Design a protein around this nucleic acid. Structure first.
Ligand SMILES: [Mg+2]
Ligand SMILES: [Zn+2]
Ligand SMILES: [Zn+2]
Lengths: 91, 25, 53, 82, 102, 150, 103
RNA sequence: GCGCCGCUAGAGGUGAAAUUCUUGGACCGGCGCAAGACGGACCAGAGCGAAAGCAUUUGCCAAGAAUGUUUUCAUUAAUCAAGAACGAAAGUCGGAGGUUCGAAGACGAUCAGAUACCGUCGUAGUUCCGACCAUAAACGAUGCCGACUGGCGAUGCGGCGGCGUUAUUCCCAUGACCCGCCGGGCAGCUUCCGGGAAACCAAAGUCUUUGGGUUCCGGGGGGAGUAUGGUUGCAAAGCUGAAAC
RNA sequence: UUACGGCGGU
């Protein structure tokens, strides 16, 4: 049924550590445990290995992504800018 | 006294009477 | 050379002058600005052609 | 304009009003006979048509649908029937 | 009382027009309330015209124009006297004052 | 005025006073029925039966020829659909908006027009249930909605 | 990103209603090697040696390869099913003109 | 802001100045680069939108008004407790970013005093993504729906009809303009329609000649949007909401 | 540029 109303995933930390540190964690913690859609096989099997490592159950492909999330928004902006600098000036 | 600055010195004042009631439980 | 020679009289602005006035008529139709983005490594004889005859 | 006899309107005051709002309401539309150049087939297309009208004998296009009143494509015969 | 029929502003079917900024005090006004004035001033200052045509490289050179579009808040438009106070029935015309160029 | 928009337009078709068949129409009451039986089997719905035989058959309105409506003779021998045409096109539109809004989650206006359409579905379904047109256990669920539309 | 994609995935959901089609890799591999395939559509997701050996058989059968601009999960919704699909082959267009189009 | 030059001793700021930056060469002039904001003039008593609101090109969408309609359904409708969706700005939480602007703050002036105006600098913030908060002079200070009651000049969008001018047009169809009519909209100008306490209003008219439908809400000024209970929010606070006097 | 106050009742 309805087991919580606020804490969600950070109900395992009990009464401990502070409300605002447990609220800070539960964005990170839903995101590192989430399955992501694979960009190579389309199956939602991107599970996280160690920190910075992202891996497919099927097609067995390992991706070097962000720490707590698959894409870091800093690393998507760069990939936009690198392919822009590669089509501008044509070196 | 202006009515938006009357509202401030009662909003500043009913967070001060809300806090003394919190002290003397 | 034929490109830059076309816009001393600005025949580009006069060519879209004729080709647009069955849509809405226009009157002050210029090429407002031309900006250079690239240069092809500067072969020396190409500049020496431009100052020839 | 107090004693305007609004039971017997003039036909040119009746015509320059809405298709509603008249003394008795009536459409502005009509059925028209269209003869193509080079066929023995009378076609009975509606004036405010909405479709790509195709014929049977020479099954070419006969009118283009538009906003208000359907436009006959090539120069073709025309009469307002009834 | 409602002083004017529009509220000083030429918006009718809108909820928000763009805020622009006044020129001589940098105050933020709506674009429709703002008192525009488009100055087509000659850049030469007409007393100084026979001192640049006698020292030019031509005998017939058309002088360039300076196209500065001012726009004011109503506070600085009344102080710099580009809009004058008007009587309570001679407010109601939208014609600008006549030219008087010569 | 208009139901879920503040427009008060006046544009709807104005029938003539004469209910009679036009003199030039040398065409029976039976032949227009069997033509309806042809081209309604060609996937067409009763709102678009009457427009193609207005524009290329001279039949101004079928009820002036046959005496019965278009959907009313589809229904006489069992080849009119279960859903009505107006309830079908609302559910076709509500699936289309909701499919947009999954990809475009941040569209606050597709979100607003969705609940206006979805309320027109239930305002119209509450009518056909009282007229025994839909079964009284019918319900527009979203998770079955795309199944209803073709 | 505005006008032109429902040239190729409005025609694709019209062949799907009218004509014939096969989905999946090893079904368009049967249809390509016995003449029945007409226009095979590859997703932008398929592994790059699978894309090669369908581009190589279609040269052998003189058929066309349209490269669909989308995911294999996106080509599946564009077909009108709840799958993902890299490779389809239409083996009869219903009444549309996908072959009579650019590829 | 930074590079590479050029020549010079001031630049900047002001009612006057100063704090400040400058021969480890400012400011200015040239050429480049990068970053983040923002889309001038065109831009209107113009348009769209339920309101907030919305402005560089082209692009995948999904919607919508009006008009046109001899299509279809045939009372399916109006307003709406409870319940929801959207909601400027500031604000709060987290991640990016950080150019300008800049609450707090430091400093220079100005004054009797300046904790202000003014000047130099600058934090949070302004920008994006995600979650919240749900209020504004959120204003036409005017609920929504329906009809009826003057004229006129226009404008925006469809539709219809007209002399003529102009476009590849050397013919045509479609455009640009010219003259009208029709519906819808933004408004304007006039009027003893009528109303009003008048300002003013073609609605705020059709009201002691008083009743078209329906929702919300007001009852002298303060106390007071307070106290208190409930409820929402991380918080700030929102909602409901008195009385003694 | 600076320009701040004017006891109560009549
Ligand atoms: Mg104030
Ligand atoms: Zn994978
Ligand atoms: Zn000013």
């Amino acid at each position: 049924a309805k087991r919580t109303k606020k804490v969600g995933i950070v109900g395992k930390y009990g009464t401990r550590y502070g409300a605002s540190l447990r609220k800070m964690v539960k964005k990170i913690e839903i995101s590192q445990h989430a399955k992501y859609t694979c960009s190579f096989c389309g199956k939602t099997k991107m599970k996280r290995r160690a920190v910075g490592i992202w891996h497919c159950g099927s097609c067995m492909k390992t991706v070097a992504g962000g720490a707590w999330t698959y894409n870091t928004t800093s690393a998507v902006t760069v990939k936009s800018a690198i392919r822009r600098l590669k089509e501008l000036k044509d070196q | 006294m202006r009515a938006k600055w009357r509202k401030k010195r009662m909003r500043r004042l009913k967070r001060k009477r809300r806090k003394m009631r919190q002290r003397s439980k | 050379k034929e490109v830059v020679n076309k816009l001393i009289p600005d025949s580009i602005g006069k060519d879209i002058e004729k080709a647009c006035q069955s849509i809405y008529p226009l009157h002050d139709v210029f090429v407002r600005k031309v900006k250079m983005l690239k240069k092809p490594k500067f072969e020396l004889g190409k500049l020496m052609e431009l100052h020839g005859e | 304009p107090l004693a305007k006899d609004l039971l017997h309107p003039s036909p040119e005051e009746e015509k320059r009003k809405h298709k509603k709002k008249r003394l008795v309401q009536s459409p502005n539309s009509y059925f028209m006979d269209v003869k193509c150049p080079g066929c023995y087939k009378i076609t009975t297309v509606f004036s405010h048509a909405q479709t790509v009208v195709l014929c049977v004998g020479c099954s070419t296009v006969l009118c283009q649908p538009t906003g208000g009143k359907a436009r006959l494509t090539e120069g073709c015969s025309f009469r307002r029937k009834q | 009382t409602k002083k004017r029929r529009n509220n000083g502003r030429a918006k009718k079917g809108r909820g928000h027009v763009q805020p622009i900024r006044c020129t001589n005090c940098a105050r933020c006004v709506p674009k429709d309330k703002a008192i525009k004035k488009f100055v087509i001033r000659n850049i030469v200052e007409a007393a100084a015209v026979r001192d640049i045509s006698e020292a030019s490289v031509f005998d017939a050179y058309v002088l360039p124009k300076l196209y500065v579009k001012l726009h004011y808040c109503v506070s600085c438009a009344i102080h710099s006297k580009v809009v004058r106070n008007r009587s309570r029935e001679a407010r109601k015309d939208r014609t600008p004052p006549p030219r008087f160029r010569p | 005025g208009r139901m879920h928009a503040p427009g008060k337009g006046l544009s709807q078709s104005a029938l003539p006073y004469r209910r009679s068949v036009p003199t030039w129409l040398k065409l029976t009451s039976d032949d227009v029925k069997e033509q309806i039986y042809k081209l309604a089997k060609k996937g067409l719905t009763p709102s678009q039966i009457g427009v193609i035989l207005r524009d290329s058959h001279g039949v101004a309105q079928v009820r002036f020829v046959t005496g019965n409506k278009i959907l009313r003779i589809l229904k006489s021998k069992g080849l009119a659909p279960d859903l009505p045409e107006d309830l079908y096109h609302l559910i076709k539109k509500a699936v289309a908006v909701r499919k947009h809004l999954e990809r475009n989650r941040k569209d606050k206006d597709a979100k607003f027009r969705l609940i206006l359409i979805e309320s027109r579905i239930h305002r119209l379904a509450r009518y056909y249930k009282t007229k025994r047109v839909l079964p009284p256990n019918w319900k527009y669920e979203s998770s079955t909605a795309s199944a209803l539309v073709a | 990103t505005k006008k032109s994609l429902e040239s190729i995935n409005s025609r694709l959901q019209l062949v799907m209603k009218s004509g014939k089609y096969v989905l999946g890799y090893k079904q368009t591999l049967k249809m390509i090697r016995q003449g029945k395939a007409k226009l095979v559509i590859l997703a932008n997701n398929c592994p790059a040696l699978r894309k090669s050996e369908i581009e190589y058989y279609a040269m052998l059968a003189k058929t066309g390869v349209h490269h669909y601009s989308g995911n294999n999960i996106e080509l599946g919704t564009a077909c009108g099913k709840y799958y993902r699909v890299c490779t389809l082959a239409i083996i009869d267009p219903g009444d549309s003109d996908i072959i009579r189009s650019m590829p």
